[PDB]
Design a protein around this ligand. Structure first.
Ligand SMILES: CNC(=O)c1cc(Br)cc([N+](=O)[O-])c1N1CC[C@@]2(CN(C(=O)c3cncc4cc(O)ccc34)C[C@@H]2c2ccccc2)C1
Ligand SMILES: CNC(=O)c1cc(Br)cc([N+](=O)[O-])c1N1CC[C@@]2(CN(C(=O)c3cncc4cc(O)ccc34)C[C@@H]2c2ccccc2)C1
Lengths: 306, 306
């Protein structure tokens, strides 16, 4: 029993974190095989970021302009390329610690673990969701660029996020490991802000199913609802529309608890309309939307990774 | 910016997790140098746990009654001893992955990271606090015994918790790595329950300081309070008394924000008396008490570990 925001074991990622220095700029990089991946704004000064031309800035750099430190050992750079907003530094040494890995671009609403790092050195690990507005509510200070987000499936680390910047609202923005930003953001100091966000409906439902699996049932009712009538209440409370594909995804949890998906939607409808009345669910006074259906199954059923 | 329940990087602990089988019972063990540590109830059947005599049960076992699996390699046991509620199995191989480590018995209110494990295989990592009633609100299923809680300081892993059991309220109970239970609990199936718990006052205050460091100030006021008058409100809301040593501990955070500790106590007094009025602090509609003053400084200042 219990339900926690649970991150994946970070060991396989810790062994890939290195430090990348270009000029006076230092940030984190990800060392897989003989390539280090880091944000391309490593080549920039603060004044560059106001309006940078990265092809021009990068053309003026050499392999020896990039210092790569992996613990004590320095790594010699033998090539460099730019792919979208990430820099790929080829090095003379394959990382002996390279895990089985993939690069994945996740959909909004999916979760991942973040290994926060400074100077190539891991600081901590925590779970995040990709918000509908393609930001994340992480925990990031100056120097954290190039920290990565990931999932682990069996042996295989699927990297899905590399940190680039913090937006004025204090939420965070970054790219997939191929350098493509999530959302409309760009690696330039301009007026750009998080757009309007919404609550991830299928995730709230999953979390309500986790609560039932863990013995909380106070919020259940005998009512039901149609998908159409639910989505109308969803719109009014700034929740994302629930699709039939979302319903199908909640299949296994609905079957494990004996609560039909549309029956859980009627429960959530009442919670949105009435509030919690000073009660809590799984230790939260809010409706939690950062657990996927997969996250609930993984933690309420004890999946492991090696 | 941002504030998250942040666990330590778990890599140094992952390399110590092994599987221990005695009879039909299988659980997790911690392999440091040439010793594996696991809960001594590994030697028990379910009927044994009703009223076990561990000296008698253990006297009837041999070294070859214990199977120890570390990934693929099986480890040969060459000795065994019981220390309080932990079993120490001596093995023929020193763990090549042994980190710098210590065993620490924490005070209630301190936090640690838990690496949840099944069959010697890490499942996930999360932060816990030792509650005042010496339970933890973890996330643990059948098979998780011998999972450990820990802190990392620089290079050194300080193990502080090994998981033994789940109490009827769904909270968790276990020992230090020397086998001494936190709280009054014993490794027997009896009527024992978590006692009355309280809210960790110094921790709530620390978290209010984290919110200020992160730009939330809506809950501040111009009032002040005396330590004595605060503690009287604390008693009424089931908060722990704030000691002068607690005040001194909050020194660095009070100095960084320019808010006197007793001024933050007056803020908290008002929050307890008025509620939050549908507002949130650091994304919580509750007063959060599972961050220590150290945890706030570590995350709002970017400490790392190698
Ligand atoms: C706060 N502001 C933005 O993050 C920001 C927002 C926009 Br809109 C556009 C840019 N932009 O394009 O320059 C931004 N960066 C400003 C510096 C950034 C960010 N950074 C970090 O270490 C960092 C990471 N996470 C959270 C942080 C919170 C902080 O309070 C301070 C720093 C960070 C280093 C990087 C950099 C790039 C080139 C030369 C020097 C430094 C990029
Ligand atoms: C639920 N009940 C108690 O945990 C419990 C409570 C008291 Br009061 C006294 C004992 N007691 O002394 O036996 C308890 N255990 C019952 C079995 C325990 C617990 N366990 C786990 O794997 C486990 C860990 N965490 C959370 C769990 C939640 C679950 O729903 C089911 C299992 C776990 C295995 C171990 C064991 C020991 C000897 C022989 C076989 C198994 C110890």
């Amino acid at each position: 029993s219990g339900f926690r925001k649970m991150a994946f074991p970070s060991g396989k990622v810790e062994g890939c974190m290195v430090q990348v220095t270009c000029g006076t700029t230092t940030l984190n990089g990800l060392w897989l095989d003989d390539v280090v991946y880091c944000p391309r704004h490593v080549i920039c000064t603060s004044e560059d970021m106001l309006n940078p031309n990265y092809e021009d800035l990068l053309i003026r750099k050499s392999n020896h302009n990039f210092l790569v430190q992996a613990g004590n050992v320095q790594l010699r750079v033998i090539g460099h390329s730019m792919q979208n907003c990430v820099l790929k530094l080829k090095v003379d040494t394959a990382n002996p610690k390279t895990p089985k890995y993939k690069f994945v671009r996740i959909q909004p609403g999916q979760t991942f673990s973040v290994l926060a790092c400074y100077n190539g050195s891991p600081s901590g690990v925590y779970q995040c969701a990709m918000r509908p507005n393609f930001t994340i509510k992480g925990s990031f200070l100056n120097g954290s660029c190039g920290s990565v987000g990931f999932n682990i499936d069996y042996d295989c680390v699927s990297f899905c996020y590399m940190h680039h910047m913090e937006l004025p609202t204090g939420v965070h923005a970054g790219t997939d490991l191929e350098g493509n930003f999530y959302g409309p953001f760009v690696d330039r100091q301009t007026a750009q802000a998080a757009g309007t966000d919404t609550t991830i409906t299928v995730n709230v439902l999953a979390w309500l199913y986790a609560a039932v699996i863990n013995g909380d049932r106070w919020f259940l009712n005998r009512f039901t609802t149609t998908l159409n009538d639910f989505n109308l209440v969803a719109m009014k409370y700034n929740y994302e529309p629930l699709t039939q594909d979302h319903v199908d995804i909640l299949g296994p949890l609905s079957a494990q608890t004996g609560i039909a998906v549309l029956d859980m939607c009627a429960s959530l409808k009442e919670l949105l309309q009435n509030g919690m009345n000073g009660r809590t669910i799984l230790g939260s006074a809010l409706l939690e939307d950062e657990f996927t259906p997969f996250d609930v199954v993984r933690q309420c059923s004890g999946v492991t990774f090696q």
